[PDB]
Structure formats: C-alpha cells, structure tokens
Ligand binder design. Structure first.
Ligand SMILES: *[C@@H]1O[C@H](CO)[C@@H](O[C@@H]2O[C@H](CO)[C@@H](O)[C@H](O)[C@H]2NC(C)=O)[C@H](O)[C@H]1NC(C)=O
Ligand SMILES: *[C@@H]1O[C@H](CO)[C@@H](O[C@@H]2O[C@H](CO)[C@@H](O)[C@H](O)[C@H]2NC(C)=O)[C@H](O)[C@H]1NC(C)=O
Ligand SMILES: *[C@@H]1O[C@H](CO)[C@@H](O[C@@H]2O[C@H](CO)[C@@H](O)[C@H](O)[C@H]2NC(C)=O)[C@H](O)[C@H]1NC(C)=O
Ligand SMILES: *[C@@H]1O[C@H](CO)[C@@H](O[C@@H]2O[C@H](CO)[C@@H](O)[C@H](O)[C@H]2NC(C)=O)[C@H](O)[C@H]1NC(C)=O
Ligand SMILES: *[C@@H]1O[C@H](CO)[C@@H](O[C@@H]2O[C@H](CO)[C@@H](O)[C@H](O)[C@H]2NC(C)=O)[C@H](O)[C@H]1NC(C)=O
Ligand SMILES: *[C@@H]1O[C@H](CO)[C@@H](O[C@@H]2O[C@H](CO)[C@@H](O)[C@H](O)[C@H]2NC(C)=O)[C@H](O)[C@H]1NC(C)=O
Ligand SMILES: *[C@@H]1O[C@H](CO)[C@@H](O[C@H]2O[C@H](CO)[C@@H](O)[C@H](O)[C@H]2NC(C)=O)[C@H](O)[C@H]1NC(C)=O
Ligand SMILES: *[C@@H]1O[C@H](CO)[C@@H](O[C@H]2O[C@H](CO)[C@@H](O)[C@H](O)[C@H]2NC(C)=O)[C@H](O)[C@H]1NC(C)=O
Ligand SMILES: *[C@H]1O[C@H](CO)[C@@H](O[C@@H]2O[C@H](CO)[C@@H](O)[C@H](O)[C@H]2NC(C)=O)[C@H](O)[C@H]1NC(C)=O
Ligand SMILES: C[C@H](c1nc(-c2ccc(S(C)(=O)=O)cc2)no1)[C@H](N)C(=O)N1CCCC1
Ligand SMILES: C[C@H](c1nc(-c2ccc(S(C)(=O)=O)cc2)no1)[C@H](N)C(=O)N1CCCC1
Ligand SMILES: *[C@@H]1O[C@H](CO)[C@@H](O)[C@H](O)[C@H]1NC(C)=O
Ligand SMILES: *[C@@H]1O[C@H](CO)[C@@H](O)[C@H](O)[C@H]1NC(C)=O
Ligand SMILES: *[C@@H]1O[C@H](CO)[C@@H](O)[C@H](O)[C@H]1NC(C)=O
Ligand SMILES: *[C@@H]1O[C@H](CO)[C@@H](O)[C@H](O)[C@H]1NC(C)=O
Ligand SMILES: *[C@@H]1O[C@H](CO)[C@@H](O)[C@H](O)[C@H]1NC(C)=O
Ligand SMILES: *[C@@H]1O[C@H](CO)[C@@H](O)[C@H](O)[C@H]1NC(C)=O
Ligand code: NA
Lengths: 728, 728
C-alpha cells in the first residue's frame, strides 16, 4: 500500500540523510554551521554562542563557497568564484574579514585565480599558491613575500601537485606543510617538463564555435614521470629586501638511483620533519627523519634514523606508505604496517632504532590511527566480531598492550557497526559518526572516562519518513573459496520471499584494496532497483579486496584483470545456484575499475551474465596513469611485465561479447580514465561485428556528476536493466 | 517461396552490380581491366589485345593501387602505398614504368609522400606536389625542376587545395592546370595562415598509448578564410633558365575589394586561359579571359572580355559558377546559366560580347555539357517526359539550334531513363551508361552515324540471380502543392497491396540542389527494408531541391532549416493520406544534411513521426564551413543573417524530442561535419532531461565507410527501426 523508493526519489534526493559536520578549534570547542550561521560549541556542556552572523556578509556581492577561520579565531578567509579542476584541485578568489575590527581587509588582498591557500597551524599567517608559485603573508593586511619564482603552468609546480601527484599520491592539490607552530613552511616542487600530455576536446556551451583542446601533463604507464624536490623555508626570517632562502632536503641515495616519488610528509616537532620516499617500483620506501641545525641553518637527516619499509608479496601500504604518528617529544612514533602474517597493524618505532614493536596483532586490520596521548593511542579497526566490513573505535594502553578497549562496539550494536571519529585538539573529546547498518548517528564523548555526553544528530526525522516507504533490507554474509572466506552483500527487495526467483544485478568495483561488502547504510540506485523493480543488487569482495590482509589483497599483484574478475564470476555462479535467484536474469555493472571488471567479465565467455553496464572503464592498463597502474602491474616492458599488460585488455575479448547485451558509457572530458579507453573498446566490438549499446556524455568527466548528466545516465541505465530483465 | 533481399545480402554484397569502367586513350582505343589484365580495345570493331599482362608487376614488391598511362602511351604511372586523406585528397608512392624498354625507372624517382601527380595533357611531362610545393619533370628519368619554395604544411598550399577548397570549391585536391599542349602550367596558391583549426582526437590502433590530435585549417561560418593567388609558368623554358618565373594573374578589382574565391580555371587555347572568381557573398562572380603576351611574357585580361554572372534570387550556380566550353579557336564558348525564367540552359558567348544567346530553353534543365565538336554540342538534360529525375543525352546542331536530337531517350525507354556518357578523345565514339530504372546497361556508340556498336555489359548474370528473389518495386511520381509539382519516390515491398497499412520510413537528405527522387536503380538498405521488413521507404524533393528551376532551388535562400524541413513533414502527411500507410508507424532518417533535417523534423513537435535516426548531422550552421554555409546563409553577423543562424539550430528544439524516439550517430574523426555537432545535440538533450539512443564510431569520418563500421551501423539502425515499428 505504501510507496516504494523510486528512481525519482533517488534522483531528486527526496530522502536526505542529516549530518553533523563540526570543526574542532581547540581542545574544548568546535564550530558548526546552523541556519547559515556559524556557532561555537562548548563540548562539555553543549551550550553555544553565535560566532558569525549569516547576515554579516549580506552586501558582500559574491556568493561565498566556503569559509575558514584562522586558528586564533581572529580572521575568516572567505572563498568565492570557485572553479573546479580535477578531483581535489580548484581555483578561487579569497577575501579576509577581520573579526576583531568587524572589517573586511582591502589592502594587499590575495590574488584572484588562487590555486591553494592555508592558514598556519597556529595564529594567523597565510601561505597560498598563485601561478604555480608560493607566497607567504605574516599578517592579513600586509604585503606577501614571494617564496618561489620558478612557477610555470604545466611545467613547474611549487606548493601544489601536478595531475598524477594530486590523484594518486597526496589526494590533495596541496603540496605545502606548515611546521607545528608555523615557524617553518615545507613544500614540494614538481617538474613535468618531459611528461607527455593527454589531449582531448572540450566543447563548452553551444556558443563556442571551435571546440577547445584540453592538454594535461599525464604520465601513462611506462612513460616519463614528473620529478620532485623538497624544500623548507623559515617564515620567521623573511625580508622585504631579500628573496627568501629555501633549504633543500634531498632524497636518500637508495632513491636517487632511479625514478622515485615523494609520498609522505609529516612534521614530528617544531624542528624535526619526516618524509617518506617511494621507488618507481613501489615495493620499497624509505623514511628520513630530519632535524633543524640552528648553527648552519640546514636540515640534516641522520642515516641512523632511516627506516626502510618493503614488501616481497606486493606494493607498500594500501595505496602508499602509511603516515607516522609521532609522540609529543618526537622521539618515537606509531605507524601502521603489514606484519609477518600479512595483516596491517600498529608498530611502535624509536627514531634511531631499526626494529619496531607491534602493539596490536590478529587476523584483522587497523584502518587508521586517529589520536595519540601519553597514555593512549586511539584507532579504528575491523576487529569486532571478525567482520572486515565493520569499523569500530578502540584505544590501547601504551603502558600495557594487553589492555585494549573498544569504545564504539557496544554503544548500539544493532544500529551501529561502522564508525569514523573526530577528536578535539588534545583528544580531550571525540565525536563518533556511526553510518550503518541503521541510520547515521552522531554522538559526542569525553575521553577521561569515555562518557557519552550527548546525541548531536540521530536522523529521527528521516526515520519517520522512511516508515511510509517499502525499504529494501541488506544481508551481509560470506561464501567460502579454498578454505578462505569472502564477504558479499545483497540489497534485498521489500518483503523478500526466498521461495521466489529474483533477477540479480552484481554491483562491482573490485579494484585492489576495494571493499564493496560492508555495514554502511546507503540510499542509492541499488536502493531503487531493489525497492521498486524487485531486483536483488549484490556486491562481492574477492581476491584483491582490502582490509583482510596481504594474502588476499596481494593475490592480484602484477596480475590485474585475473583473479578479481574470476572471483566475481564465481560469486555470481554461486548466487545463481541459490533458490531465490533466477539464473536466466543475472546482470553486472560497474564504474571506473568496476567498468573494467564488468567488461572483462562480460567478455569472459562464462555464460553466467545476460547483460552488463560499464561506465568509464579502464580498457588496457597502458592507457591509465603510471603511479596507480605500475603500483600493481610493474612496468610495461618485455623485461618486466609487458605480456600481462598486453593480455589483460578488454579489447582482446571483443568476440566473446556476441552472447551478451552490453551498454558502454563514458564522459568525453574524462581526464582520469580517458574517453580513449572506451573509444578503443567500441572499435574492437565493431571490428568483430558485435552489436551493443552506447552513450557518451559531452564534457562530463570521470564522475559524470553534473545534475542533468547524473539524472540522464541513471535514467538511461534503468531502462537498459529493466529491458534486460523484461520488467514493466 | 522465393527468398527476400535480406540485410546480410546488402552488407555482404551477394547480389553484385556489374559495370564497365573504360579509359579512352585516343579517339578510338580504350583500356579495360579484365582479370587483373589491362586490355586495349578497338572501339570500331571490339577486338582487343593485352596492353599490360597482370603478371608484369609481381616482383614489384608492392600492391599497386592504380595506374595511369602518359598521353603518348610511352610510360605508365604506378600508384602504391595509397593513404586516403579527405574526400578527394590522398598520399601515395609512385613509380614510372617505361613501356618501350619494359623497364621500371629507378633514377630521379618521384618522392614518397607525393600529394598529387599528373601527366601533361600531351606527351609525357610530369607535374607533382610534394611538401606543398610544385615540381615538374620534362622526362621521367631526369631531375625535377622546382617551381615553388613557399610550401608550408597547413599554411601555404601550392598546386593543391586546402580543406575547404577541396571539399566545397574544386571537388578535387589538385590545384594545377596544364595548358592544352603542355607548354604552360597554371596553378593556385592558398594561404591559410590565419584560418582557425578544427582539432579532434584520433585514437588509431590499440597500440598507440596517447591519442593523436588531428589539426586542420578549416574556416567555420563567418571565420577568416584562406586567401588565394593564381600563377602561370612556362614549362618549356625550365631547361633554359635557372629559375622559371611564375607569372601571377591578379583577380579583378571587383573581387579585390573584399574576401573572394578562385572558383574555376579553364584553358581556352594554347595561349588563352579563363578564370572565374566568386565574392565571399556568392551571388556575384566574374570571369576573366587572359592572353599571353609573347613580347612581355606577361598575361593580360582585357576588360572587354570580362563576363559578369550574378543572381538576385540566390547564389550563383548550382554549387558554384559553371565551367565554360570553348570552341577550338577560343573565340567563343558555351556555359550553363539560368535564364530569365530561372532554368539552367546553355548560353553561347562571344568572348568580347557581354550578351550571350541561349541555345536551349524550356521548363527543364541542362545538367551538363559533355562534348563539343566543330559541328555539334552534346549535353545531358532532364527534358525527356518532363521528368526532372531522368537524364538523357542530346545533340544540338551548331549551325541550326532547331535541330536537337535525343541520342538515348528511345534506346530502351522502360529500362533506361538515367544516362551518363563518356566520349572518346575527339568525340568519335561514346559509351552510354544507363543506370536505371532497370539494371544498369553499358553500350558503345559511333558518333559519325549515332549507331549502336555493341553492348558492353547488360548485367544478365545479376538479372538471373534477382529472379529467385522477392525484390521491391519503385514508384516515381509527384504531388501538387501550391500549383507546383513536387516529386517523390517510394521503395514498395513485394506484392504491395494498397488495401493495407504499411509502416513508412522517410529517407531524407533535402539540402539545396539535392534530388532524392530519381530513376536510378539501387541495391541498398532501403531495398532490404522493403523486401524483408515490408517497410515502405519514401523520399521527397521539396522546396530547395534542384534541377527544377531557381524558383524551387532558391526558395530556401538565407533560410536553411525552414521550407525544406516543413515540406518533408507535409510530404509524410500526403503519404498517409494515400491510404496505405500506418499513421502510427512513421519514421524518418537521414545522413549529413539528412541528419540535420531529420533532427529538425523530430524536434518540430508535428506529432507525425514516431522515431528517427540522424547520422553525422549538422546541428548549427555556425559549426559548418564558410564556403558551403555562407553560400546559402550569408554571414552570421547581426548586420547580415545571424538571427536565422541562431534560429535554425537543432539544440533549440531539444524539449520537443520528448515526443519521439531518437537514435543519434556520429563518427569521431569526421573532419567534415565535426563530432562537435552531435556533441552539442546530446548535451542539449541531456540538459532538458530527454532520453535517446546514441552511438559514436571511433575513428570514422563523415562516410563511416570502413567495412566493419558500415556493417555495424546498418545493423544497429535496423534493430532500432524494427524495434520502433514493432517488427520481429
Ligand atoms: C616555533 O619553534 C621554533 C623552533 O623551536 C621557535 O624558534 C626558536 O625560538 C628560540 C627561543 O626564542 C630561539 O632561541 C631559536 O633561535 C628559534 N629557532 C628558530 C629556528 O627560529 C619559535 O619561537 C616557535 N614559535 C612559536 C610561536 O612558539
Ligand atoms: C620489488 O618488486 C620487483 C618486481 O617483482 C622485484 O624485482 C625483480 O623482479 C623480477 C620479476 O619482474 C625478478 O626477475 C627479479 O629477480 C626481481 N629482483 C630484482 C633485483 O630485479 C624486487 O625484487 C622486489 N623487491 C623486493 C624487496 O621484494
Ligand atoms: C584490332 O583488329 C584490327 C584488324 O585486324 C587490327 O589491325 C591491324 O592492322 C595492321 C595494319 O598495320 C596489321 O598489320 C595487323 O595485322 C592488324 N591486326 C590483326 C590482328 O590482323 C588491330 O591492330 C586490332 N587492335 C587491337 C587493339 O587488337
Ligand atoms: C600568407 O599570408 C600571411 C598573412 O597573414 C603572410 O604573412 C605576413 O607576411 C608579412 C610579409 O612577409 C609579414 O610582415 C607579416 O608579419 C605576416 N603576417 C602574419 C600574420 O604572419 C605570409 O607571408 C603569406 N605567405 C605567402 C607565401 O604569401
Ligand atoms: C626562384 O624564384 C623565386 C621567386 O623570385 C624565389 O623566391 C623568393 O626567394 C627569396 C629568397 O629565398 C624570398 O625573399 C622571396 O620572398 C621569394 N619569393 C617567392 C615568390 O617565393 C626562389 O627562392 C628562387 N629559387 C632559387 C633556387 O633561386
Ligand atoms: C604549344 O603552344 C605554345 C604556345 O602557342 C607553343 O609555343 C610557341 O610556339 C611558337 C611557334 O609556333 C613560337 O612563335 C612562340 O615563341 C612559342 N611561345 C611560347 C610561349 O613558347 C608551342 O610550340 C606549342 N607546342 C607544340 C608541341 O605544338
Ligand atoms: C558555555 O557555557 C559557559 C558557562 O557554563 C560559558 O561561560 C564561560 O565563558 C564565558 C565567556 O568566555 C564567561 O562569561 C563565563 O564566566 C565562563 N564560565 C565558566 C564556568 O567558565 C561559555 O563561554 C559558554 N561557551 C559558549 C561557546 O557559549
Ligand atoms: C625541469 O626539468 C627539466 C628536464 O629535466 C630541466 O631541464 C633539463 O631538460 C632540458 C630539456 O630537456 C635541457 O635542455 C636542460 O639542459 C636540462 N637541465 C637544465 C638545468 O635545464 C629543468 O632545468 C628543470 N627545471 C627546474 C626548475 O628544475
Ligand atoms: C581579481 O579580479 C577582481 C575582479 O576583476 C579584481 O577586483 C577589481 O574588480 C573591479 C571591478 O569588479 C575592477 O575594476 C578592478 O580592475 C579589479 N581590481 C582592483 C585592484 O580593483 C581583483 O583586484 C583581482 N585580484 C587582484 C589580486 O587584483
Ligand atoms: C585514486 C583513485 C581510486 N579510487 C579507488 C577506489 C577504492 C575503493 C572503491 S570501493 C569503496 O567502491 O570499493 C572505489 C574506488 N581506487 O583508486 C584512482 N586514481 C582512480 O580513479 N582509478 C580509476 C580506475 C583505476 C583507478
Ligand atoms: C559538397 C558536400 C555536399 N554534398 C551534397 C549532396 C547533394 C545531393 C545529395 S542527394 C543525391 O543524396 O540528394 C547528397 C549530398 N551537398 O553538399 C558538402 N560539403 C557536405 O559534405 N555537406 C555536409 C552537410 C552540408 C554539406
Ligand atoms: C540566515 O539566513 C537563512 C537563509 O539564508 C535564514 O533562513 C535564517 O533565518 C538566517 N538566520 C537568522 C538567525 O535569521
Ligand atoms: C628575486 O629573484 C628574482 C628571480 O630570480 C629576481 O628577478 C628578483 O629581482 C629578486 N628579488 C630580489 C629582491 O633580489
Ligand atoms: C585455491 O583457491 C584459488 C581461488 O581462491 C584457486 O585459484 C587455486 O587454484 C586453489 N588452489 C591453490 C593451490 O591455490
Ligand atoms: C591474370 O591475373 C588474374 C589475377 O591474378 C587472374 O585471375 C587471371 O587468370 C590472369 N590471366 C589469365 C589469362 O589467366
Ligand atoms: C620510398 O621509401 C622506401 C621505404 O623506406 C625507400 O626504400 C625508397 O627508396 C623510397 N623511394 C624514394 C623514391 O625515395
Ligand atoms: C547579394 O546578396 C546580398 C545579401 O542578400 C544582397 O544584399 C546583395 O544585394 C546581393 N547582390 C546582388 C548583385 O544581387
Ligand atoms: Na549522554
């Protein structure tokens, strides 16, 4: 009788999840935007005050995209004229409002088209990047000091990353790192001089007569990579009469012998900085720990304080070497690394000691270190109940590792099995964000005795609306394969009846270290498919998936397009044998890496799938970037791993597509997985006489997320799936 | 039951049409290829001999793409390494074979990557273009004489056309013209220095890691055009002077005042050349007739010999001012021009008299002048039976214009109504090529007595095969609209029954001077649709179509996207009113201009059509080239015709597409109608939430003619059509 969750509900966002994004400004207070007003909250009592009026900038003219209060609450950086670039990069215009004198600064303002800006960690200094060069402002209203002068579009990047470093290494545009108290400003410099350019058309509005050609330095597998240099400058000794002096910290000799990457920068103390370097063959990384020499004014990194991290079974770290977590005095540090059994755990290092000591162990993994005090280290792991798709917050006593306490496990076991956390400045307080299997729940806690102070947001409004809807349920479980358990999830239609046969859609990603089977609550396309079309949407984490140890994750090392593809077919095979699945109506779909796997599956000749949809798929690894591809595949040379590069393409399986229905989709302005990848798939299908469905999205990138494109792609795929399953 | 003409029959060319391609080498001998053997034929008796044994070039070590015999029969030009470029241009390697000595010339060989090469009209002189510069060889084995040094890729073109001159002006790649006896070499020079470039990706083989960006000087509507210059060099002096002087012949003052084009070059005698220039606003053209001045070595064009041709109703010429045909002495010439009534007829000009005399007249038109002797002028027209869609050969007596004989009308009136002709060197013989309505028939005739010498090819073999097949029929008729007759044709299913309701597919092109209703016999996609799918495939020539006078052709002047679009809609109405059409199943489709008209029709909101397919459509006139677009649309400026330019786009009708099923298709390497045109249609449809079908063809151009793509696209379109008409 009640309505179902429809395609329109998903597309129009009828049912919204409420959140509670706060920002810690001290060890006791946080900012929260309410009614467009920014309020300051006292964590102990829950009382608040208005920090900034939503009306204060009424006659500002420009539409503010975001704001950023200086650490000392004295200034607020206003961001506007936002123009997106890649996944993290963008340029904007900035203005600064003096909160003390309630006045907007008009002298020496930050330039327009600024690529990145950031307050110093303490006080109110500024460091921004413009035209690829670094600038520092000791005071909001004072003239800025030019730090670098080599900045050159698409060639030299100071303080910001190029395309590949942004996407595959730092997951940020930013390549600036303020020392703890703001004395030093460390930055990286990238040189893409010999990096080939990916070129593609951009059509723009109808009014543009000639299409524009976008050119982006983008190193494909085996190509020339950007080179990197690291520098540290003293912002306390800057002169208006002399060009600032930047001190360079060179990479270790073991890295200089060949191509390499700078993969991590983490300050230990006011005068100690750590950096990790990664060889192009990503199974060997080195950590340098460098101390400032007050006499010479140089930075020295004692060889005795070097830390090597390598792997024999695969690459290093999940996507890159993990970040260290230094103690107060910076003499020791905690870092997640795979142990001798292949599971990622916390190892305790002494800076000038080679062997580290594991403080956690077991057939499960630590996801991340979240906070550290002299008595405790707080972290998230999937240990609880052995569910690799669950996440809980734990604390471990540094003086006795046998004492591990779970802080989120038992708060509400039925509703919450997946948490992330946010600690205040000195870990005095923490916010728990539960996101599944029930509706998101946000809470505030105090560390001293782990008290549950109060509920910030429980989504009771949403829960009330969802009561009048026939919502699907989610089953999370596992199947066995060679004495190994692999998890999967099924979004089951409302009133699931195991005596009936339901068509089944396999939602896949399956890239290395991926996880598509978890306890997270989601309102997405699958929700509609199961609620309205009574289609079962399943996902499976096979070989190559993460958070279950290296034996599983490294199974596809140097072998992409093999086991993770085979395991998806196996899962579907097993699901088709279950009583509630109509083995005549089984489909598969994926986006990005999932598009690749979906394509490899459809072209495998397995006969298990009737149809499938691939969105922006990778088609041959030589078309994807160096940093990510080489991480798993090595180099595409005959002496390294070229053969597997050549027979792991979608194109080579073209002929096998004759017995399935295939829908191939891709945005023409995809800067990540180039349209080229789908252009070559379609040509190969054409070459063997295989008919298929296609859709390109003019000017859309990898996310095909503009409002209209988003509604259009999902509307189009819905028709395809319904048609494939013979649904009304 | 006799089998039908299936889709596979079409795509596989099972029922092959035979033809008879011969090459006159003199006034009574021609070459014909039989079993890869080149034979020479005596026209008068039909006997032959082997001119070049098929096994002559086995050890050539290369597959020969084409050959060319020097006028004097002494040498043969061998063309290999063929590399297609645009519609007419291509690159290739060449070797010259000495027929006398039966050896292959190995000295001073024609360079590889030669853009164009042509024998002199007499003798065996050679002129060729390499790296955009002109070269001449007096003897096949001797060194070449360089003629130009300004050649520069994509910038300066000597002796060859740039993109727009090749496609829209000369319908050829070559821009050089030998004088009748070969003494002079005339040529054009194009400068595209300021012409904007169209840029698009070319993905090539799967092995290419980075896509290639194809860049070509291409002037869109209202953009900067290439400028041109004309020169004449005396090749007979090449061996006597170090650097022969290229004498320039400047355009007339009436053209130099603004942008203009060189549109025709035709030699009249050994020392007189005629040139026609066309203003950028193509409704005014001027012909200069220039004589060589033996004492000054210069070329002068007496204004007394200049001829003006303009139009008040439209542009000049069908697609460009027509070519003149001079009498032997070069003192007079015949040119096709539209008379006072708007019909194109032959006008006889005296070179120094501005008033010409029409030698033909009537409410029909002369298609072309085929040959001229001292006694007769032979031409093709559509006068016979008042059928604008028919074509016949006529002979008019020069000393008595009232004496006009139709040489082909009555040869076989039921089987042949569309003729084409090929005269021997001095018009002593002529091959008639009947192409419909029955099977093609090739016959040879003697000019002295206009007697049929013999049948060359009658397609008896195919006629035999077509017997066991249920072939469709073709009806050619007309409907009266506003007191004017408008022709149409229908491909009717076998056993057509007027008492039934048949789904109807409107096959459209409809560009200016187009003709989709004729008497030509075709074996194509429509054949299969009528024969197997029992679909009626119709075509209509409304306002704007050609060969029926300027009142009809110039009806869309400055107004593309209006009448030719509406008339096509009105035609469908008229057909449904004929009683044998299922008004619930009316589809429309077209390629190129047909794609545009189809799109405009589908987006007009007429309700008449259910679905439609546009292949490589134009979507907004500002995206197409200057020469073609401006010819009908004038300039896209507020002072000229911008308002209609902005008003005749497909994008502006996006919202109406919600009423129909649309399949949009386009080749990504279309250098003619850029992919851009379809990219903008799709974005516009996505922007208003309209679902549709799409297909891109990787690396295909405007013809989507590669073997695999051709089969793939017609297969894809058949599924869509069958689906729309609800056919098994
Ligand atoms: C941030 O840390 C730096 C380094 O410890 C501090 O600078 C030092 O301060 C001492 C005491 O004033 C001086 O004797 C040293 O010469 C300084 N070293 C350098 C490299 O400048 C700095 O004062 C700290 N900043 C804040 C705000 O506390
Ligand atoms: C890091 O991985 C590479 C790649 O597997 C290892 O380098 C060589 O790999 C090839 C196979 O591609 C073998 O033939 C060589 O024996 C490997 N060693 C050398 C020196 O070339 C490399 O050994 C790995 N490093 C570590 C520490 O495991
Ligand atoms: C076609 O046949 C005619 C008639 O036979 C050939 O004429 C030749 O005429 C010359 C005169 O110089 C005689 O010496 C030859 O003996 C004749 N040929 C024959 C076969 O008798 C003519 O050459 C033939 N043309 C072709 C292309 O085969
Ligand atoms: C092609 O046309 C261009 C004009 O756009 C000519 O280039 C100009 O040449 C003059 C004289 O040498 C220079 O002073 C200008 O600076 C040039 N202008 C530009 C925009 O480049 C060019 O010389 C012409 N080429 C030929 C062979 O005629
Ligand atoms: C042949 O003659 C032409 C025309 O005089 C020469 O071309 C000129 O070359 C000079 C210097 O190289 C340039 O400054 C002129 O602009 C050119 N004019 C033209 C129309 O191209 C050509 O260089 C001569 N060739 C030889 C070998 O002397
Ligand atoms: C081709 O035509 C040219 C031009 O008429 C001929 O060259 C002229 O020949 C006459 C002799 O009859 C001389 O008086 C002139 O000096 C030549 N003019 C030029 C520009 O060269 C040429 O002889 C003819 N070629 C043939 C093979 O008949
Ligand atoms: C939250 O409540 C406390 C009182 O319980 C507020 O008051 C503290 O700070 C005020 C200004 O800084 C003073 O007026 C009070 O004397 C002081 N009280 C105590 C016990 O310290 C506090 O400011 C409030 N915080 C917010 C963000 O409103
Ligand atoms: C950026 O990297 C380039 C490439 O390595 C540096 O220049 C080098 O490469 C140039 C082009 O190949 C050569 O012509 C140069 O000789 C070579 N070395 C130098 C010093 O230019 C370039 O200097 C780098 N720029 C910076 C600021 O580091
Ligand atoms: C970035 O652009 C803005 C907007 O152009 C600049 O602000 C001024 O804007 C007014 C009108 O909007 C113009 O008349 C001025 O030329 C602009 N500049 C100034 C100094 O007033 C802004 O200044 C630009 N950023 C920087 C650093 O100059
Ligand atoms: C950095 C980008 C990345 N994203 C992920 C990821 C991990 C888990 C999942 S999930 C949670 O869906 O399983 C989904 C995506 N891996 O790599 C990566 N440059 C990227 O965009 N590529 C596209 C094709 C191959 C890599
Ligand atoms: C030169 C090209 C041309 N071809 C024709 C033509 C005439 C009759 C017909 S028919 C015989 O099918 O009616 C079919 C095509 N017009 O223009 C012209 N540059 C071209 O390629 N464009 C593409 C879109 C608009 C022009
Ligand atoms: C701030 O603005 C919002 C809308 O932008 C308005 O609804 C709200 O009432 C304002 N806040 C206050 C305190 O009035
Ligand atoms: C700083 O360096 C730049 C370029 O190296 C130079 O042009 C500028 O004059 C220098 N400024 C000072 C104050 O020395
Ligand atoms: C074990 O199982 C894997 C798949 O999980 C399979 O590929 C392999 O062949 C099996 N046997 C061994 C020895 O690994
Ligand atoms: C000439 O070569 C062709 C193609 O190889 C062949 O078909 C033909 O038989 C040859 N000529 C003769 C007389 O056999
Ligand atoms: C053309 O290219 C081929 C292939 O490299 C070469 O061997 C040959 O000599 C060239 N011919 C000429 C005329 O330059
Ligand atoms: C040519 O066409 C333009 C645009 O319609 C017009 O203004 C002009 O008068 C025409 N010229 C002639 C000679 O007809
Ligand atoms: Na509480």
């Amino acid at each position: 009788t009640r309505k179902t969750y429809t395609l329109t509900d998903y597309l129009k966002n009828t049912y919204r999840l409420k959140l509670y994004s706060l920002r810690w400004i001290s060890d006791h207070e946080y900012l929260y935007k309410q009614e467009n007003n920014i309020l300051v909250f006292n964590a102990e009592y829950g009382n608040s005050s208005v920090f900034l009026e939503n009306s204060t900038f009424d006659e500002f003219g420009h539409s503010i995209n975001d704001y950023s209060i200086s650490p000392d609450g004295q200034f607020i950086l206003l961001e506007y004229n936002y123009v997106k670039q890649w996944r993290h990069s963008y340029t904007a215009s900035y203005d600064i409002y003096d909160l003390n004198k309630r006045q907007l600064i008009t002298e020496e303002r930050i330039p327009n088209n600024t690529q990145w800006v950031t307050w110093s960690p303490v006080g109110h200094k500024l460091a921004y990047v413009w035209n690829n060069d670094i600038y520092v402002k000791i005071e909001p209203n004072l003239p800025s000091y030019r730090i670098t002068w080599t900045g050159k579009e698409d060639i030299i990047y100071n303080g910001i990353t190029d395309w590949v470093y942004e996407e595959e290494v730092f997951s940020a545009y930013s390549a600036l790192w303020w020392s703890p108290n703001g004395t030093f400003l460390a930055y990286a410099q990238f040189n893409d001089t010999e990096v080939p350019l990916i070129e593609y058309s951009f059509y723009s509005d109808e009014s543009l007569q000639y299409p524009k050609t976008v050119r982006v330095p983008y190193p494909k597998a085996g190509a020339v990579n950007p080179t990197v240099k690291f520098f540290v400058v003293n912002t306390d000794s800057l002169s208006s009469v002399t060009n600032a002096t930047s001190i360079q910290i060179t990479a270790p000799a073991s890295m200089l012998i060949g191509d390499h990457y700078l993969c991590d920068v983490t300050w230990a103390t006011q005068e100690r900085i750590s950096l990790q370097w990664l060889r192009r063959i990503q199974n060997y990384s080195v950590m340098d720990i460098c101390d400032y020499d007050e006499s010479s004014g140089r930075w020295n990194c004692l060889v005795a304080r070097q830390h090597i991290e390598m792997s024999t079974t695969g690459w290093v770290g999940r996507f890159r070497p993990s970040e260290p977590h230094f103690t107060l005095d910076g003499n020791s540090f905690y870092k997640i690394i795979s142990n001798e059994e292949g599971y990622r755990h916390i190892c305790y290092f002494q800076i000038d000691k080679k062997d580290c000591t594991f403080i956690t162990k077991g057939t499960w993994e630590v996801i991340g270190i979240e906070a550290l005090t002299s008595d405790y280290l707080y972290y998230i792991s999937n240990e609880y109940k052995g569910m690799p798709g669950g996440r809980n917050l734990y604390k471990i006593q540094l003086s006795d590792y046998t004492k591990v306490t779970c802080l989120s496990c038992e708060l509400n076991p039925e509703r919450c099995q997946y948490y992330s956390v946010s600690f205040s400045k000195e870990a005095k307080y923490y916010q728990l964000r539960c996101s599944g299997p029930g509706l998101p729940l946000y809470t505030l806690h105090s560390s001293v005795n782990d008290k549950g102070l109060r509920v910030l947001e429980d989504n009771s409004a949403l829960d009330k609306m969802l009561q009048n809807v026939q919502m699907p349920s989610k089953k999370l479980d596992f199947i066995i394969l060679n004495e190994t358990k692999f998890w999967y999830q099924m979004i089951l239609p409302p009133h699931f009846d195991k005596s009936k046969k339901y068509p089944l859609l396999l939602d896949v990603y399956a890239g290395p270290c991926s996880q598509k089977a978890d306890t997270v609550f989601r309102l997405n396309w699958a929700t509609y498919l199961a609620s309205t079309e009574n289609i079962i949407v399943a996902s499976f984490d096979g070989r190559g998936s993460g958070y279950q140890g290296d034996k599983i994750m490294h199974a596809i090392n140097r072998r992409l397009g093999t086991f993770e593809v085979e395991d998806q077919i196996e899962a579907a095979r097993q699901f088709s044998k279950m009583g509630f699945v109509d083995n005549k109506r089984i489909a598969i779909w994926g986006w990005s890496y999932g598009g690749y796997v979906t394509s490899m599956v459809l072209g495998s000749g397995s006969g298990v799938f009737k149809c499938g949809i691939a969105v922006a798929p990778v088609s041959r690894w030589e078309y994807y970037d160096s940093v990510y591809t080489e991480r798993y595949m090595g180099l595409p040379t005959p002496e390294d791993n070229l053969d597997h590069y050549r027979n792991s393409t979608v194109m080579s399986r073209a002929e096998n597509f004759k017995q399935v229905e295939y829908l191939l989709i891709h945005g023409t302005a995809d800067d990540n997985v180039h349209f080229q990848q789908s252009a070559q798939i379609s040509k190969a299908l054409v070459d063997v006489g295989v008919d298929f469905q296609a859709m390109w999205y003019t000017d859309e990138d990898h996310g095909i997320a503009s409002s209209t494109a988003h509604q259009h792609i999902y509307t189009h795929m819905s028709h395809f799936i319904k048609q494939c399953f013979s649904l009304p």
